[PDB]
Amino acid sequence: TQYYLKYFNPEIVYPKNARIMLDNGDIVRSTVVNNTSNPNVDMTGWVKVSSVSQIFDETYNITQSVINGNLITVDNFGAKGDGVTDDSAAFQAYCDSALTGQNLYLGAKGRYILKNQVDLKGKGLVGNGCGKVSEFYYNLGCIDVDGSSPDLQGKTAFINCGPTIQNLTARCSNGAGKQVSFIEIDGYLANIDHITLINFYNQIVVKQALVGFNFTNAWLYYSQNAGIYCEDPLNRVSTTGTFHNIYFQLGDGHAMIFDRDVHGCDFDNIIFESMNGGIKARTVAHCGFGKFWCENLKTATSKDWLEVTGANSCYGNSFTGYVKLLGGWTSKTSPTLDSLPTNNYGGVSVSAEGISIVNAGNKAKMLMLPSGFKTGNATIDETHISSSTVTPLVKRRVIGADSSGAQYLASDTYTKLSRKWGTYNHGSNNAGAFYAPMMLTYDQSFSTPQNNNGWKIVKESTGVYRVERVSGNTSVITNGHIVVGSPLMGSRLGTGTGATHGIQMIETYAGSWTSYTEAAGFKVFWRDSSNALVDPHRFTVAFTATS
Amino acid sequence: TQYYLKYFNPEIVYPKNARIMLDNGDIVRSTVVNNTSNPNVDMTGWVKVSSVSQIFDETYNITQSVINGNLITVDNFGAKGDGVTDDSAAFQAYCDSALTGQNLYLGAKGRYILKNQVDLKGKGLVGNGCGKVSEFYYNLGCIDVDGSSPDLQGKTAFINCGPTIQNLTARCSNGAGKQVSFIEIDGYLANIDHITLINFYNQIVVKQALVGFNFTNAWLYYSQNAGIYCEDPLNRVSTTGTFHNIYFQLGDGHAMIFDRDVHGCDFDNIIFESMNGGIKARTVAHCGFGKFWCENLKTATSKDWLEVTGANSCYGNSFTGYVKLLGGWTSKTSPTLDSLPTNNYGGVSVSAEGISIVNAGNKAKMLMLPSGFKTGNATIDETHISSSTVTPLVKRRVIGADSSGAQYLASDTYTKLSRKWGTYNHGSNNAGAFYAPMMLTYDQSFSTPQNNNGWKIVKESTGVYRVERVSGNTSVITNGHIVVGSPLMGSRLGTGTGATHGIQMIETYAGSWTSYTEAAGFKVFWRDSSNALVDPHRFTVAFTATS
Amino acid sequence: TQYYLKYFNPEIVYPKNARIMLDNGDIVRSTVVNNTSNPNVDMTGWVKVSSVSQIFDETYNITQSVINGNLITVDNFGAKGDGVTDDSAAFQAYCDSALTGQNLYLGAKGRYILKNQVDLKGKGLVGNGCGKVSEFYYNLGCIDVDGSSPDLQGKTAFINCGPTIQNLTARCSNGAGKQVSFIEIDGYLANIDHITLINFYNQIVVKQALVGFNFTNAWLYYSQNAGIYCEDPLNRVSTTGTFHNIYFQLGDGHAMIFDRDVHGCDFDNIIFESMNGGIKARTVAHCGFGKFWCENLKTATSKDWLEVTGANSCYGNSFTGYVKLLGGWTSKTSPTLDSLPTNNYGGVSVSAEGISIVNAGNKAKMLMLPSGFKTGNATIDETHISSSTVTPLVKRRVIGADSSGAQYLASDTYTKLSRKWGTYNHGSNNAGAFYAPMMLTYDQSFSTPQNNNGWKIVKESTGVYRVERVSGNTSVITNGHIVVGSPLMGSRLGTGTGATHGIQMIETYAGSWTSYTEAAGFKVFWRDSSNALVDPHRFTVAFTATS
């Protein structure tokens, strides 16, 4: 009478809305008229008044039950996040539930211990913060995998991850030597961002091959084998993966290991600090590499920041950010690196160190520096972009000023028949040129006549020599310059006696020279001091095929 | 007596804190003394005890009502997310509510059907996960627009979106041919990231023009017209938009369509897989393009990855990532592409294919490859960076080693008056040089005298010729080398007779040559075998203006 | 009898599950048998039935108390977010609470006023949306710092921020001239993304130095001093910071100020609109700079987009995006900028403007444009990539077509002893060449003999001259070409008389020339018209050391 408490009584008929207590003390309300059912064994016709399905938010005129569908976490399934209790069953219940969405979520605060593998069943993973690598952040929010658990030895803690890993701090405690990896995620369609992973054997285990795989803003500390590992067991070939803003620190192994081939992937703003390896792959093809900061090795003495193991399997790449190398890191991608005859890390390299380009399987490499150019094969080509164009080139070079004081660029000539360098006199307004003539020498001791460009010198008769076209030479001299050189008389060594020359042109057709200054060649006539025709043993001529 | 149930009684005075039931069975509590008001018609002086305003979390000493303000979603407004029920009214109620924040949020799990257009009223859109393109993820969390709804035909499903679209999966079901687009968002200030969009006509409809518009990490599948469409009807000109990590797959149209002009935008790590078009725009100016992976076309046979329609309207760009082309995709931006006289896709292009630079409206293009250089206009210039500097250049080239075994780079000379290539003898420690002299020919059959660089040859008298400066030529010979060539006697063809020459310098001032080896020119004297002066018809001289 | 209300009565023994009212009207339930304790003064053995610890979600069989641990915000601690009430104490309570996780969170809707500094105690900051810069978004969700509050003058509103700032809109109201800054965050390990900051003195205050610091997608408007400020008081040197997708608008000062040194940082897709300064630092070393859009200055007339104050302290950089300059912005990094002898902004610069490379402390700079090349020091070098290789180079140049119509690239020669340019006659199938010979002049008026490449000319006897090797010249002539020039007789000016020459080779060993065409040099013999030996005053020779 002085308090409220009534248990079920089988003699009573409970009207609609009547309230009594279950034997455990919880109040139930009848939802039907003439209720004679015992709510302790049969809840038909009754509801528990302390249930959120019976509590309403008047602002929305909906039950608290509905509002509790806004955000569901592992806490809903009994996870404690208390740094001690194994929450693996709660995590699994979440992933097996009909009520949960695309991703698994952690509660606001908790250090969630996992002593058994969790099958995410295709759900992604969203944590409760991306923290620094310190106990302060682990205590506020993280997944803490128990690496000492026998059931996790040699296994990955999370399998069948969906396309999301984000906003997460996750560590492995007491797993040294137990080969506990963190998470398995498929290579096709992933967004991984804002994560901090601490310890583990492999931190990110990629299944199958990359394609549309995006990875950014990750602090990956103390991995024992790799920060990111992609086996690609079926050799699908990884493509179109992006890896940005990743800090790899104090790992016993590599930053990234691809057992096989990587194509069209992008790597930028990556840090290797005290690792024992950088990025390792069998093949790296048509990938982009931006800025890398490589500082110190954990126990190794020397390591390449990028390690490609296949012969001529590093090609088509863009090494277009500066790679900082400190404390033992080396590079096979620097613009200033000398080329090899084969097995170069093929690609374009652009940084303050230089602008260069090289292919994997050839010695050719060009490098531009502030001073000019360097070549890897002792050769520099100059030609047309079009492979079909067969005109000569003209090079223009600043040599002075015109009368107004503007730069004067002079033009050269390099054809099959002419080598010249232009000039100009702005005082008198006359073009000019410097000449590299054809030179050609007759020597009666030669086994075969010397030939320059289809011309040879032959003796016609005593004292008369033809500088003549050989069979097939249809080229001509047009208004050319002619210089005859010095005679060696009497023998190849020469007696020291002299001779006087004159010339006569050889026409291509009657009147070709007289009228049009076209010639096939020319004759040289040699005479002694008595004006008699004489035969030198050897003499030179120099001539041009144009004016 | 054996249960608890009391309805309102008008004869009773209810004290403060008294509890009774409303006619519907819900308990009310009196908040005032002497309460005689019927709570069924007048709740003044009463509160409903099952309301969250009357439920407390003792940890915080606040009502559940306050806690329910932490996260509000469309579920608060009656959205079912059940794959059947039209939730459009609930979505609209959310956007019209005084209680909701910057963005619209989905509940934890739900496939939210929309059969009518939703006006976001400036709210952004945050989903419940960025999933793969599969029913598994649609069933867990997405917006599912009913493309068969007559009220959505030819319209956009969401209008007036705020500056956020994120963490979202959205599809259009049964909308083939109905031209249903997904969302309209203003071009000024946007962050779009971690989205998956499936079907629709235009997936992202940008209103007005881009500026400060950031778009990343998007899987855009099966669009019928475009993944991203920007009309820019007022021709404001789009600027400063970023488009990164986008996978366009199996669209019937283009990846991106700009009807007008795009300036200063960045595109990187984009995939076109089985599309019918890449990025199309009227003008593309000063944009950055990084890595593209273009593989296969849906029904088209050949498409450019970047399609710019305006004449000379592609200029100032950076094509600085590798563009992979497979299955019909083409490019107008490759470093190795030959230049056109006009309508080039103007910009710098850098990849393993080459390093090149070209302007839109000119044939000039330079390309650096491992082998050396290629030009698009048969010309290569060498000059100063400064347009006012008018000194000559010096080229240095490795030609051997010095006595210590270090590389010896020799210097050339190319001035208005001298062309030489330096050398050095490290055995005797003497500099040397190779010479390209001026050559100049006299021919009495010429209509006008030949002139080289302000010098011509004229007959002074029988057998005496001046190699002399013409009016305005104030340049000089300093300690030069002189070679006289071969005479053609008697006629232009030549008789074949010879002659003997000597020279005499022409001074610039009295003693200039004798004392300072400066000359204006020189005379050539020709004599026959009897030492009498004679006149050749034609002869050559070669000389240098410096030693 | 006609309502439910019973207060505590000390004469009564309350059984387990008995319910009565506290004096305030709240119902309590006995949890123990034989309960005689007054719940108004002693809650042992009682529980409040309206507490969320006594409310259950039957879907999960957990209390609402547990569900309320899923998301905790400042609203849990009494924050009103009403645009008037100071919520600083509530924010501080959140950060001091044992219940909260890594980050501080805002409620769904609220304009949260702060009139006092909040110490985040190492917690990061997560807002309720990243809005546009307008009252519409401030009213829906932001932090609104009261800049008129005396307690905030000259201070930062938030101190000791954790590694996260995201999804946030924050403004300072009425703070003009009060030097109120927004937030202090440590430089080591940060993820800042999707923020909008309005007003403040310094918006982001970085403590210590950058390392693993990632900053993206930020709209930073109206700062009075800087958008981002890093003092680095201990000169630790900032490294490995990324700054992407940042819109700086209408700031009275700079976008970013580093008082000291920055290494290995990346800046990309940044906008300066009506600022009074861009990025300022003492040292910028090995940093990457991508696309910048710089449009207009607030009150300044001219500002560099990048301002590095230290002498030769801008070096090693990559300026590899286009920098748009409008309305007064200038640049010291353009590829077309002329080099200085010192204090260049050192690095590689790549854009549609050109491809260039320069060092800080030297005049050297190379630039490639569509036309060819430009140099900053009037010099262009061509050498090997290897510093130890001492072979000559060969340049190949397109000069025509072969008989099949394919491009023919001809090879040059430039050794210590030979300068030639190759050619080929495809009509007759003969190689050819153009020659730049050594030239060397004898002059009896010279104070010392002229020397070219270890050869000089000396008089042996009347009319006999040796073109001979000097001591140490062990180089040889092999099958060379020889041309003797024109004699100046009788005096340096010349009388005009002539002479006739012949030559004789000088062997290196007996038979060297006769048998193997090897010579040390050659003799020149000069004779008058009566065939008597005579001595010219001066004469030239031209010769080659190879055929």
Residue numbers in the entry:
A (entry chain A), B (entry chain B), C (entry chain C): 19 to 565
What's written in the study?
Here we present the crystal structures of the TSP from bacteriophage ΦAB6 and its complex with cleaved EPS fragments of Ab-54149, a clinical A. baumannii strain in Taiwan. ΦAB6 was reported to belong to the Autographivirinae subfamily and to specifically recognize Ab-5414917. In the present study, the TSP from the bacteriophage ΦAB6 (ΦAB6 TSP), which specifically hydrolyzed the EPS of A. baumannii strain 54149 (Ab-54149), was characterized. The structure of the N-terminally-truncated ΦAB6 TSP determined here revealed a trimeric β-helix architecture. The structures of ΦAB6 TSP in complexes with the semi-hydrolyzed products provide deep insights into the substrate recognition and product specificity of the enzyme and also elucidate a retaining hydrolysis mechanism, for which the catalytic residues have been verified by site-directed mutagenesis.
The trimeric ΦAB6 TSP∆N is a compact, elongated molecule with an overall length of ~166 Å and the diameters between 26 and 63 Å. Each subunit exhibits a parallel β-helix in the main body and can be divided into the N-terminal particle-binding domain (PDB), the linker region (L), the receptor-binding domain (RBD), two triangular β-prisms (TP1 and TP2) connected by a highly interdigitated segment (I), and the C-terminal domain (CTD). The central RBD region (Thr225-Ser483) folds into a right-handed, parallel β-helix composed of 8 complete rungs, with an extended α,β-mixed turn on top, where a 10-residue α-helix caps the hydrophobic core of β-helix domain. In contrast to the β-helix of other TSPs, which typically contains 13 rungs, the β-helix in ΦAB6 TSP has only 8 rungs, and 4 of them contains the fourth β-strand never before seen in other TSPs. In the linker region, three α-helices from three different subunits form a helix bundle stabilized by 6 sidechain H-bonds between the three pairs of Gln216 and Asn220, rather than hydrophobic contacts observed in other TSP structures. The exposed surface along the interface forms an elongated solvent-accessible groove of ~40 Å in length and ~10 Å in width, where the hydrolyzed products of Ab-54149 EPS were bound. A close comparison of these TSP structures revealed ΦAB6 TSP to be more elongated in both the monomer and trimer, likely due to the extensive structure of triangular β-prisms as well as the fewer coils and smaller loop insertions in the β-helix domain. The structure exhibits an organization similar to the structures of other Podoviridae TSPs, despite the lack of homology in amino acid sequence.
